[PDB]
Design a protein around this ligand. Structure first.
Ligand SMILES: Cn1c(=O)n([C@H]2CCC(=O)NC2=O)c2ccccc21
Ligand SMILES: Cn1c(=O)n([C@H]2CCC(=O)NC2=O)c2ccccc21
Ligand SMILES: Cn1c(=O)n([C@H]2CCC(=O)NC2=O)c2ccccc21
Ligand SMILES: [Zn+2]
Ligand SMILES: [Zn+2]
Ligand SMILES: [Zn+2]
Lengths: 92, 96, 96
C-alpha cells in the first residue's frame, strides 16, 4: 500500500510512501503531492517548521483539509517547498 | 528489482524510476521527476489530457526517441506545478 | 530497511532517501532529485562541473556544517531535471 489517499473521498491519491522524508508524527512530510488546492496566501504564524510559511491544502475533489504546503522564506534552505499532511486525513 | 525505467530504444538511458510514479485524479505513466529528456518547443494547452496543464514534447537526450511530455500547471493553486506523462511502451523496466 | 541517508558527521540529520536516487549517466557521487536539511553556500559555478550543462553550489548540513555535496542547477531551460543534488556517498550513513 504505497498510495496515500484522501480518507474522506477515498479514491483520490494525495501522495505516496516514496515521497516521505524526515525534516526532524501527527504530520507526514513529503516532497511531492497531487490533487490538492491551495487556499489563501502563505503565513509564518505558529509555523511548525521554522523558516517555512504554510498555505492550507485541501483535497481538490471533496475539499477535505489534508494539510499544508510549506514554502521556504530564504533561498538557501532545502527543500524550498514540501507538504505537511495530517496522517489521520489519509488512507492508509 | 526492475526499479529503473529506461529508454527502450537506446536501452542504457534512465528516464525515471518506479519510485516517482503517482496517480492523478493509463497508456501514459505519470511521474513527479524524470531525467535525460530534452524539451522540444514551448508549452501548449491544445487537447491537454490533464485539464489545467500545458504539455511540452519530451525526447530522449541520447537517441531523440519521443518518450512523452512535461506537463506544466496554468494556475498557481494546482499541485503538482509540473509532472511528466511518459508513454509506457517507450520504456524498459531495468533491474539496475 | 535503511531508506534514510543521514549526515555521517551529526548522524541524526536526514539529507535524502534511497527513494530519490536516479542515474544521469561516478562511484563517489550519489545523484538524488530531492534532499533536505542542507544550506547553500555562495553562488552557482560551472567551473569543472562533473555534469555538463549544470552549475554547482556547495551544500552543507544545516546542523553540523559538514560538506555533503552540491546542488546542481541547469544552465538551459530544455534540460531535465532543472536541479538535483550530487552528494558524496562517504559523507552519508544509511539509517531507518
Ligand atoms: C488552526 N491552526 C492550525 O492548524 N495552524 C497550523 C498551520 C500549519 C503550521 O505550521 N502550524 C499551525 O499551527 C494554525 C496556525 C495559526 C493559527 C491557527 C492555526
Ligand atoms: C500528436 N499530438 C499528441 O500526441 N498530442 C498530445 C500531447 C499531450 C496531451 O496532453 N495531449 C495530446 O493530445 C497532441 C495535442 C495537440 C495536437 C497534436 C497532438
Ligand atoms: C574543491 N573542488 C571541488 O570539489 N569541485 C567540484 C564541485 C562540483 C563539481 O561538479 N565539480 C568539482 O570539481 C571544484 C570545482 C572547482 C574548483 C574546486 C573544486
Ligand atoms: Zn477528498
Ligand atoms: Zn534513448
Ligand atoms: Zn550534519
Amino acid at each position: 500500500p504505497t498510495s496515500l489517499c484522501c480518507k474522506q473521498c477515498q479514491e483520490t491519491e494525495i501522495t505516496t510512501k516514496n515521497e516521505i522524508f524526515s525534516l526532524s508524527h501527527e504530520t507526514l512530510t513529503v516532497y511531492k503531492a497531487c490533487n490538492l488546492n491551495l487556499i489563501g496566501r502563505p503565513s509564518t504564524e505558529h509555523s511548525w517548521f521554522p523558516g517555512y510559511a504554510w498555505t492550507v491544502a485541501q483535497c481538490k475533489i471533496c475539499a477535505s483539509h489534508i494539510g499544508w504546503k510549506f514554502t521556504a522564506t530564504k533561498k538557501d534552505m532545502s527543500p524550498q517547498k514540501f507538504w505537511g499532511l495530517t496522517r489521520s486525513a489519509l488512507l492508509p
